[PDB]
Design a protein around this ligand. Structure first.
Ligand SMILES: [Zn+2]
Ligand SMILES: [Zn+2]
Ligand SMILES: [Zn+2]
Ligand SMILES: [Zn+2]
Lengths: 215, 215, 206, 206
């Protein structure tokens, strides 16, 4: 009603409201943030950092697919050129991508993209399959974050930065709108060997279920 | 010093400061936003919209590469499934990607990604080549936004949504940190034929240079 | 160089001395062309070859070929063909960091992990060949799970998926037993194939 | 079906009746294998075939093959080979919406636009062939602009890029004249090739 006009109007009064308050208008990035296209609170706000200090990639279900030229080159640029020492993979609750990933309907091109979430499901299927169906999505969102960190750590870019003695740590969090909190999923890597132990330990922890959701 | 701890600390007091102020913690998206990984003001703030109403993809130099599975499937999901009626490609000033695109140094994997900005440069090389070198980056950022809108409009996904009578409009803006304003680059498509005219008209307008920067 | 000028001579002399019905997804290592080992007439084969004959879910290149094959060319048979002594499969199994190609091969390594119990009670020298077969059945399964092939079946189109390995050692193709003409047949034969591969003969056991 | 059971028979009878030095980036339409038209010994060719023999800047599949070829296999020659009657090039030139494959072919269409003045003073029936040649020179140029090939040259590695078209009509390969052994030679021969193609003979003129 028209929605583009409202956006332009909101943009204008925003900028004018900022300039009224100070002189709000260089800064080098310190984290690479890999997040989900359908999350709704932004990283810069959620993490309450200075603007400019997050380098941000957002795709559906916040994935690091082994062969995705988009994300890979972003990671390569962050690490090799911008020399960012932290990559963070942030999932979130009530994630549309994960939901689209689990529902059977073919949605078209995007299903192909989401097939990597489905392999992950079937990888931890024994775990997810003894979980009551209505809770699966919440666990898959967590395990997804664990697997993408592991994926990131296995990329040739990251392994090589570790091999040549460059400082680089990988993190995997889930943002929960329900309390505003970032929650650690336990996979934290500064090396190939921290990657393996941390990931394995993380899946082991996730695999212990609340009695009220089992068979 | 440690930077991860500060982030967690900032996250906590943020969430606690929001809950103090109200009960800040469903909403369907209305725009697909395609933006740049190194821009620093977020879309949700910049456009001052309700959270949840932007579906956001961010990659380096805000590109829609014909064959990028990541962005394409995002666009396909937005249009075919979420039924978003507006895709916005937002570039910005002092864009690192464009700068990396123009500097000669091989930066590695990312140069391959940026080669599409370089083809664009050489496509409008006659224009950019009669511009004083120190201004080129600013024009290339604008022309880039024009070309990516055109790319979006030529994807099979968009053409098909137009063919079956679905409402879909494409926009191409540049965010200017220097005044907070979103500036229209002139390419605005609701159909294949609006795409062509609008794009052509846009390049023609961009090609008229300020006398003080020519030969 | 000489090599190149030799190439042209060889072609020039070869010239003087002288629609498709299948999509063939074979491997870039393989040494015997599909057209030769199948003895098919020139033009029957519409061919894609990549490293380790892969159908990666999100690879635009291969997915494009499949879509073009099925929706436009109206091909009714897609054959995925692995082979023995596959340098890709061997590369994927080494610890060595090879750069960009490693990221491509990580998909194979995920396969290795997926059937790691099976491969773990196998003899070291025989693992590459098992993984080569497992790989074939998995790419067929991957093909059958594309939106493209699923829409084709859904809409009633006659389409059949095949997974074969070509053994250099003797020139014979061997069907790996995952063969789909629908989504339900895909499930059944994929699972059957893995179950068949899981039953091990004494002189493959560690 | 019968077709398939026929395929195996043909292979079984063909069997009874019976490191690589080049990377070959050819097209999935082409009907004559590289190994045949070059008369090379089996295993000399390490092969990638996609639609319209493309080296798209950001295609992981093809870029992976090149990296593996150059950095690991240590191949010193990459040949890009277009051909006449290329169904991909024809597909790219039609107005018809073919689905996913169109997005793949948009890279060719960008090429068509790029040399649109040249193609615009050409006769309609002869355009596909001009675009096929232009396409070859452009993919070679694309290959020479990858970080992979540029690092290889930079670091002193012996690597040569080639761009040929194979004409079905008579079996002869014809060099398109863009041949690079370095970044500076790439520029010079690419530009030379386009300039050569731009000089038009009377019976190609509209
Ligand atoms: Zn999400
Ligand atoms: Zn930027
Ligand atoms: Zn092989
Ligand atoms: Zn062809």
């Amino acid at each position: 009603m028209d929605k583009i006009k409202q956006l332009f109007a909101n943009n204008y009064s925003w900028a004018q409201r900022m300039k009224e308050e100070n002189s709000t208008y260089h800064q080098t990035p310190h984290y690479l943030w890999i997040g989900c296209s359908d999350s709704r609170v932004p990283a810069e706000k959620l993490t309450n950092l200075e603007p400019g200090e997050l380098f941000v990639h957002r795709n559906v279900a916040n994935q690091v697919i082994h062969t995705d030229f988009n994300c890979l080159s972003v990671v390569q640029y962050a690490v090799d050129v911008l020399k960012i020492e932290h990559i963070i993979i942030c999932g979130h609750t009530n994630c549309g991508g994960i939901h689209a990933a689990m529902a059977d309907k073919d949605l078209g091109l995007i299903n192909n993209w989401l097939l990597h979430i489905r392999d992950i499901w079937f990888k931890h299927g024994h775990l997810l399959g003894k979980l009551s169906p209505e809770k699966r999505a919440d666990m898959l969102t967590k395990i997804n974050v664990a697997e993408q960190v592991y994926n990131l750590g296995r990329t040739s870019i990251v392994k090589s930065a570790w091999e040549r003695g460059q400082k680089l740590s990988l993190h995997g969090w889930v943002f929960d709108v329900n309390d505003g909190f970032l929650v650690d999923q336990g996979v934290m890597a500064t090396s190939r060997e921290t990657l393996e132990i941390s990931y394995r330990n993380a899946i082991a922890r996730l695999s212990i279920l609340d009695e009220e959701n089992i068979l």
